[PDB]
Design a protein around this ligand. Structure first.
Ligand SMILES: CCCCCCCCCCCCCCCCCC(=O)OC[C@H](COP(=O)([O-])OCC[N+](C)(C)C)OC(=O)CCCCCCCCCCCCCCCCC
Ligand SMILES: CCCCCCCCCCCCCCCCCC(=O)OC[C@H](COP(=O)([O-])OCC[N+](C)(C)C)OC(=O)CCCCCCCCCCCCCCCCC
Ligand SMILES: CCCCCCCCCCCCCCCCCC(=O)OC[C@H](COP(=O)(O)OCCN)OC(=O)CCCCCCCCCCCCCCCCC
Ligand SMILES: CCCCCCCCCCCCCCCCCC(=O)OC[C@H](COP(=O)(O)OCCN)OC(=O)CCCCCCCCCCCCCCCCC
Ligand SMILES: CCCCCCCCCCCCCCCCCC(=O)OC[C@H](COP(=O)(O)OCCN)OC(=O)CCCCCCCCCCCCCCCCC
Lengths: 114, 318, 80, 175, 70, 115, 98, 347, 105
């Protein structure tokens, strides 16, 4: 039949959000609340046209937005966030309910700073 | 470093099996107005060692009229089934975390009967066949009620995972909202482990030695430690089900010591049950789990299906 | 019917207890008002991904942000 | 070799099937079907459905123990041909094992065989999926949906089982 | 008296203390000083292999914080 | 992978003790040691005779009730549905049909043993 | 298709030739029947799990339920046969030949 | 037997048949087949004699093996289709296995061996229920999948069963074996036309059901199971001899009786498609069927066999049997030929 | 005698199961949901003869999604040629197929 189409490797290159899953899980709610617009645009397009080859620039944009959010986090409250994701990462199942004190500390620092 | 973990699981359980034989002989001495073994060592601490060394220097004695393949295969299956029984037990971290551990215990409980059945069949004996058919009748008596009791209890847990059973009763004990289910569970595991008053397989009065009446030393010891590992892990299973302890993820030794004390007290109560009651018949047991336990269990299963819908207390499945 | 109940409780109390428990379990979800809360709790558990709809222009009920006022909230799950 | 894990489990599956389909003695047929059920549970567990494997293993173990009781009551003789005790049983066991190993050698050489369908030579890891299942297991959710979707299936299954109890009780009556 | 069985009971106590503490220590050693990850469903497995890929050591318990990014 | 390593470790622990229990000690095997044990006297017939079983009906209904409880185990996952009323009704109806079958066997003397 | 399908249908064919050639024992043919139902179960759940037909996961449970129901029926008929004659041999069922 | 249990079992048999007839799923078709078989097993064990055990065991083994082949065909269709709808099969292997499964369920040669033995070993009412009710669900499923059946296989089965039933009906003195071989011939007649026009198969099914029901009710009313027992009816009730005479004349396809209408329409339909040798062969083997019908009607109606002395004692008592719908069914089985274009309602 | 009762009465008994693209618990899609949708919509209301004549492309593509004959056939060709090239000595595998390449995410 037809020769299948595939974008070149230069179109797929992007700066990566290189963090562990505990960093994502700790700041999941802030990431969901702050970066809703490019994430939801990417999700709408990805569910609409059903093609990852036509949904690449929006993935690029969502990577830049997530990296910008984390770079903003690193500038102000690096140490409470470090303690919070460490207390998340000790748990085997990564429970939210075992680190309510670091939850309050991170929430207070982020709310007062940003 | 998984093989080190496996070895450090499988060696202490058989050491504790030998010392449970010691403790059982001492308690079975001390309740009946006498003493246990206290001559071999300091308060008889070397009796299981002497018993173990004695049983491995005696004659093997494979019978001529017995099919040798199944005769050798059955004790190996019994010991291996008792040894792989212990794997997903969380103390507080299991060796193998499994999504469905409860069904694995149920399937391996079904499989472990076949060692008794084939050891009875292979040894060409009438008493061995009698013990084998008594084991068959005992299994068809207890298995349905055991599975449905465990089903109607796990409905408040949300999943078959045993580690979730620690979290699901971290507020209050699970023996409170299922105390009747706890009693019938205890009776069902008394019947599962072939212990008194539901022995009915290794009967020393109705028969001489049951399905292992032809098994000489060595191979017979495999059935002995298989049965004692079975009773220890079944008490451990009951302790996890109904008597969950406080778990600190930073100090797991607290949960380990609490759990160990509770399971030891359960085994003490098990030997206490052993030295108190006459043995049932093997048809009176069939009229016990069917005419008395099964209708109440069906009613309790209706109750524990409707109750989470009733109180909006459906547990999470995650 | 009271004499029969006394006789059956004197003879086989296990069957009486089982029949009472089964009857309780049958007739209680009909009359209890907390079952709808269980229904809504089961409905409000997010297993899938909540995919967004294209904004044509005439849809003021659906929000534009997770922190917008309009939409189905879960205050009752906190209070209960 | 480890990529062919389901292949090795299916070869033990067919080995047990030809062990107990020779019909040596129903005790050894029971042992063979126990082996086949356990390794079939293994096969379907590497394909992902652990619940289905555990159920088929448990159900077949219960049925095999009851039928063991039956043959110790009913289907037994003085000298049971356990294996090698009869000419035709040993002959057909060897014939089945030889045929099975022959076609395994054939499919591990040409990497394609044609018995009436066409079967490929690689392992069955290729036909898997690269996506994730999220926060649920598909088989458990399907058999959970048995209650909420399949009300008709529940009705016909329960009625068939109740009249099956009636059927077996009115068969063993004697008059 | 009745406390002479307590030697054997205490020996059973330490023999049942051994395997749980051994599994706890082995899990805390072979996972970089933390609890072993529990992957019940495939989302947790995908996240665990995501950490295994970002870590760069082919060892997922080596956890990279936010200092990895620019 | 770890489960097969554990099962193999248990199996070669079990078969190591049997293999050292057959070759180690001194053996004195005669044509009297391996005779079947019949409480001191010679048996009167073979041990492979038909050993008749009285609980056949209970075994058949054990198969049927084992399958009934096999159908019943998806209940913890089925409680996580949205059509909660229909699931509750079908669970209750299945358990009620199980109880009806048990009661019909009870009233018809099916659980009573033959002879 | 995959070679696991080859082995599953090949096991089904083995148990089919086992059922269709009797060895003077009815219970062995019953065992072959349960082997065939086990093979059907394995084949069905393999394709159902591979093609992600999630709603069809309730099917093989029902198939195995009816398998056990017909097995129980076979055992009951075998009790009647063994209560008429001495044994369960299939050659004793030759009254309907005249 | 408890009549409540008997009523429940009969309604369960009917429920399995309609579950097959109304479902749009292959698994539901299979469930209906299983529940029908497992509910009709104890009807055949009503009198509890060894012959009933033999008949039940042979019937159970045959229907079990046929159900296994049915399930294998269903699973192969699921593999090659990914769906479950009751329509044509998407694989020739599945079509062949399904056709042999339904042939084994229908008692078609060369899977015909169990039918005379099972029919003989069970009472007359259970044989009637078998030969009429049980031969509807396989015919319904065969009606559903007619785009996919191989023509050569089904025509081989049809002419083979016609020849074998007509030949085997010549060597029987028991009435139930005669009726089973006649049933085999009639299923050959119906399925020879199924791939050409299935309305002809439905018409043949209805007429054969009516005819064999009338004859089984006659045999139940006279309480005769052998031909020498049937020969006493002229000394008991001559009107019943007239009834069996006209029904045996109709069963051989002798015009102007209603049993000739199915064979006439089969020959009419199969010659629109230029097949002339086959309906001639089916006509000659129908002549063989008419031969053993003629032998039976010579035994019971056209001659007066010697009777016994206790027939006087039987003369003194009038019959109290429940001959349900016997005159209506006899009239429908004899004189439905001038109403032949009624068959269009089955279209 | 397909006495269709379900459409006459308006109830459904086995209609939700019969195809792979029906309603699923929280909308879990099958592997070939789209191909089944295309083949079903191609051959609706035109009969079986016109279904096998006028939707052969869609049906055979769906059947290739189901069993994947040609996919493993092409993979077998590639694997066999690569093995022969490796054994003969005209090919060397790249480093990213050897075990490490500093993987993407
Ligand atoms: C692990 C934690 C602790 C577990 C608890 C058990 C520990 C102590 C064990 C003691 C020794 C046991 C040794 C083995 C004994 C075996 C025999 C045996 O137990 O047989 C069972 C016996 C059998 O009794 P039976 O043998 O006398 O039966 C007589 C039968 N007839 C009459 C036909 C002759 O009892 C039962 O079956 C009862 C089971 C438990 C019932 C629980 C009911 C709870 C309350 C319900 C509600 C009541 C209020 C009224 C209704 C209200 C409604 C709203
Ligand atoms: C889990 C607990 C058990 C663990 C495993 C067992 C632990 C103990 C292992 C050693 C046991 C003692 C040695 C083996 C058994 C000997 C039994 C016996 O009676 O042997 C007599 C026999 C000698 O008998 P004999 O040669 O006089 O012949 C007796 C038979 N007649 C007279 C008829 C000919 O001893 C041996 O054969 C020697 C065995 C090995 C001795 C040590 C070798 C070096 C080991 C380092
Ligand atoms: C002649 C007599 C017999 C002689 C030989 C005896 C051999 C030993 C017999 C005893 C052991 C039988 C085991 C049977 C299968 C048991 C399956 C099992 O334990 O599954 C548990 C578990 C389920 O996993 P799950 O809950 O889904 O969670 C994983 C998700 N992260 O699963 C897992 O965690 C997956 C782990 C890998 C599974 C690989 C596939 C199974 C391997 C089976 C090997 C062969 C077994 C043969 C048994 C024969 C029995 C007679
Ligand atoms: C509607 C509620 C839900 C119903 C569905 C769910 C039921 C769950 C429980 C299932 C029980 C299954 C087994 C039932 C068997 C009943 C028949 C039976 O065996 O009765 C025997 C018994 C007398 O014993 P005996 O005659 O000696 O028995 C022989 C040896 N034991 O006979 C008796 O003891 C009498 C048995 C009949 C009368 C029971 C009355 C119980 C009343 C409880 C309070 C009212 C509850 C409300 C509902 C009305 C119930 C009638
Ligand atoms: C092609 C079709 C035949 C495939 C198998 C061919 C080899 C086995 C048969 C060899 C010939 C002997 C034979 O058929 O024996 C029938 C035997 C029962 O015979 P029996 O009554 O015990 O003794 C009379 C025979 N002297 O009954 C049996 O042997 C039944 C058991 C057969 C099991 C077959 C399993 C192997 C795989 C076959 C292919 C799939």
């Amino acid at each position: 039949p037809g020769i299948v189409e595939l974008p070149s490797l230069e179109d797929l290159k992007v700066q990566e959000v290189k963090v562990s899953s505990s960093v994502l899980k700790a700041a999941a709610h802030h990431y969901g609340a702050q970066c809703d617009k490019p994430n939801k645009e990417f999700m709408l397009c990805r569910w609409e046209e059903k093609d990852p080859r036509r949904c690449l620039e929006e993935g690029k944009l969502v990577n830049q937005c997530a990296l910008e959010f984390f770079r903003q986090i690193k500038r102000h409250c690096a140490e409470p966030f470090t303690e919070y994701w460490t207390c998340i990462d000790y748990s085997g199942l990564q429970l939210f309910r075992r680190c309510r004190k670091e939850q309050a500390q991170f929430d207070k620092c982020v709310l007062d700073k940003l | 470093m998984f093989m080190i973990n496996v070895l450090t699981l499988i060696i202490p359980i058989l050491l504790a099996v030998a010392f449970l034989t010691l403790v059982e002989r001492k308690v079975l001495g001390y309740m009946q107005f006498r003493k246990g073994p206290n001559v071999v060592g300091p308060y008889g601490l070397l009796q299981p060692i002497a018993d173990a060394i004695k049983l491995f220097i005696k004659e093997p004695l494979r019978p001529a009229t017995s099919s040798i393949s199944m005769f050798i295969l059955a004790p190996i299956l019994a010991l291996t089934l008792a040894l792989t029984m212990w794997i997903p037990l969380p103390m507080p971290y299991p060796l193998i975390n499994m999504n469905l551990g409860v069904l694995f215990m149920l399937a391996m409980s079904s499989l472990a009967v076949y060692s008794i059945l084939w050891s009875g069949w292979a040894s060409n004996s009438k008493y061995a066949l009698i013990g084998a058919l008594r084991a068959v009748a005992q299994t068809i008596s207890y298995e349905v009620t055991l599975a449905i009791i465990l089903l109607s209890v796990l409905l408040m847990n949300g999943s078959f995972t045993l580690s979730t059973l620690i979290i699901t009763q971290e507020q209050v004990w699970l023996i409170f909202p299922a105390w009747p289910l706890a009693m019938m569970w205890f009776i069902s595991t008394l019947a599962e482990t072939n212990r008194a008053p539901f022995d009915l397989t290794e009967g020393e009065s109705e028969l001489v030695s049951g399905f292992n009446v032809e098994y000489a030393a060595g191979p017979f010891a495999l059935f002995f430690m298989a049965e004692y590992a079975n009773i220890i892990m079944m008490n451990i299973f009951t302790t996890t089900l109904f008597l969950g302890a406080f778990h600190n993820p930073y100090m797991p030794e607290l949960y380990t010591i609490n759990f160990t004390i509770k399971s030891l007290l359960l085994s003490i109560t098990f030997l206490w049950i052993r030295a108190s009651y006459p043995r049932f018949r093997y048809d009176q047991l069939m009229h016990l789990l069917w005419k008395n336990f099964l209708p109440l269990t069906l009613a309790l299963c209706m109750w524990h299906v409707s109750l989470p819908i009733l109180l909006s207390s459906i547990p999470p499945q995650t | 019917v009271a004499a029969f109940l006394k006789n059956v409780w004197a003879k086989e109390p296990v069957l009486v207890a089982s029949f009472a428990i089964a009857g309780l379990a049958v007739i209680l979800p009909t009359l209890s008002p907390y079952t709808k809360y269980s229904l809504m709790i089961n409905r409000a558990t997010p297993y899938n991904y909540p995919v967004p709809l294209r904004d044509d222009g005439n849809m003021p009920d659906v929000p534009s942000h997770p922190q917008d006022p309009q939409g189905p909230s879960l205050e009752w799950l906190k209070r209960l | 070799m480890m990529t062919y894990i389901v292949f090795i489990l299916s070869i033990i599956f067919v080995m047990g099937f030809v062990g107990f389909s020779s019909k040596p003695s129903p005790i050894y047929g029971g042992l063979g079907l126990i082996v086949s059920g356990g390794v079939g549970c293994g096969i379907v567990l590497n394909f992902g459905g652990s619940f289905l494997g555990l159920m088929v293993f448990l159900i077949y173990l219960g049925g095999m123990m009851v039928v063991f009781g039956y043959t110790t009551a009913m289907a037994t003789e003085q000298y049971p041909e356990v294996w090698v005790s009869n000419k035709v049983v040993l002959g057909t066991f060897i014939t089945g094992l030889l045929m099975e190993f022959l076609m395994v050698y054939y499919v591990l050489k040409d990497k394609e065989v044609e018995i009436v369908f066409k079967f490929n030579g690689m392992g069955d890891w290729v036909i898997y999926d690269t996506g994730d299942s999220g926060f649920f297991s598909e088989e458990a959710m399907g058999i959970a949906a048995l209650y909420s979707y399949g009300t008709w299936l529940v009705i016909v299954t329960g009625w068939s089982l109740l009249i099956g109890v009636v059927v077996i009780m009115e068969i063993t009556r004697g008059n | 008296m009745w406390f002479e069985v307590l030697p054997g009971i205490a020996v059973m106590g330490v023999c049942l203390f051994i395997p749980g503490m051994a599994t706890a220590r082995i899990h805390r050693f072979s996972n970089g000083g933390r609890e072993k990850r529990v992957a019940h469903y495939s989302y947790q497995w995908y996240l665990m292999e995501r950490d295994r890929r970002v870590s760069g050591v082919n060892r997922y318990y080596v956890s990279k914080g936010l200092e990895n990014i620019d | 992978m770890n489960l097969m390593i554990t099962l193999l470790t248990n199996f070669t622990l079990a078969t190591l003790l049997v293999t050292i229990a057959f070759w180690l000690p001194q053996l004195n095997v005669y044509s009297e040691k391996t005779s079947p044990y019949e409480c001191g006297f010679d048996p009167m017939g073979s041990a492979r005779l038909p050993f008749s079983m009285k609980f056949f009906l209970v075994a058949i209904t054990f198969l049927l009730f084992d399958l009934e409880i096999a159908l019943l185990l998806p209940l913890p996952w089925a409680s996580q549905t949205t059509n909660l009323n229909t699931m509750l009704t079908m669970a209750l109806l299945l358990i009620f049909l199980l109880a009806v079958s048990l009661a019909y066997e009870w009233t018809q003397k099916g659980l009573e043993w033959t002879e | 298709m995959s070679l696991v399908y080859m082995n599953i249908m090949m096991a089904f064919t083995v148990s089919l030739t086992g059922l269709l050639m009797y060895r003077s024992h009815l219970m062995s043919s019953l065992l072959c029947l349960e082997g065939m139902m086990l093979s059907l179960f394995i084949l069905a759940t393999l394709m159902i799990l591979n093609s992600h037909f999630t709603l069809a996961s309730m099917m093989p449970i029902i198939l195995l339920v009816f398998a056990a129901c017909e097995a129980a029926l076979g055992l009951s008929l075998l009790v009647m046969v063994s209560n008429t004659y001495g044994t369960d041999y299939v050659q004793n069922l030759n009254l309907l030949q005249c | 037997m408890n009549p409540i249990i008997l009523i429940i079992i009969l309604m369960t048999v009917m429920l399995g048949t309609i579950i097959v007839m109304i479902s749009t799923h292959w698994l539901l078709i299979w469930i209906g087949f299983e529940m029908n078989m497992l509910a009709i097993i104890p009807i055949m064990m009503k009198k509890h004699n060894p012959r009933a055990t033999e008949a039940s065991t042979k019937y159970f083994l045959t229907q079990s093996t046929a159900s296994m082949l049915l399930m294998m065909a269903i699973i192969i269709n699921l593999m090659f289709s990914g769906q479950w709808t009751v329509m044509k099969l998407f694989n020739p292997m599945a079509s062949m296995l399904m056709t042999m499964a339904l042939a084994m369920k229908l008692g078609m040669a060369p899977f015909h061996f169990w039918v005379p033995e099972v029919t003989q070993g069970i009472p007359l009412s259970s044989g009637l229920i078998l030969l009429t009710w049980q031969k509807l669900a396989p015919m319904s499923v065969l009606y559903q999948i007619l785009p996919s059946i191989n023509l050569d296989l089904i025509l081989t089965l049809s002419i083979l069963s016609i020849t074998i039933g007509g030949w085997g009906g010549l060597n029987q003195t028991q009435l139930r074996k005669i009726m089973a071989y006649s049933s085999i011939a009639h299923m050959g007649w119906m399925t020879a036309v199924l791939l050409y026009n299935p309305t002809m198969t439905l018409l043949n099914l209805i007429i054969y059901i009516i005819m064999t029901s009338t004859m089984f009710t006659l045999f139940m009313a006279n309480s005769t199971t052998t031909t020498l027992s049937l020969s006493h009816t002229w000394n008991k009730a001559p009107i019943m001899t007239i009834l069996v005479l006209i029904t045996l004349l109709s069963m051989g396809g002798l015009p102007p009786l209603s049993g000739f209408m199915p064979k006439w329409m089969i020959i009419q339909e199969m010659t629109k498609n230029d097949s002339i040798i086959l309906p001639t062969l089916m006509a000659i083997t129908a002549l063989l069927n008419l031969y053993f019908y003629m032998r039976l009607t010579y035994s019971t109606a056209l001659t007066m066999f010697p009777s016994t002395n206790n027939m006087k004692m039987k003369w003194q008592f009038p019959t109290t049997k429940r001959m349900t719908l016997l005159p209506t069914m006899t009239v429908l089985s004899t004189m439905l030929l001038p109403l032949t274009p009624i068959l269009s309602i089955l279209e | 005698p397909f006495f269709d009762v379900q459409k006459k009465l308006g109830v459904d008994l086995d209609h939700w199961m019969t195809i792979q693209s029906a309603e699923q618990p929280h909308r879990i899609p099958a592997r070939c949901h789209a191909f089944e949708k295309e083949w079903i919509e191609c051959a609706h209301g035109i009969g079986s003869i016109r279904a096998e004549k006028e939707c052969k492309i869609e049906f055979e593509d769906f059947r290739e999604c189901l069993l994947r004959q040609k996919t493993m056939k092409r993979l077998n060709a590639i694997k066999r040629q690569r093995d022969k090239l490796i054994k003969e000595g005209k090919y060397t595998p790249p480093p990213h197929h050897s075990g490490q390449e500093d993987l993407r995410p």
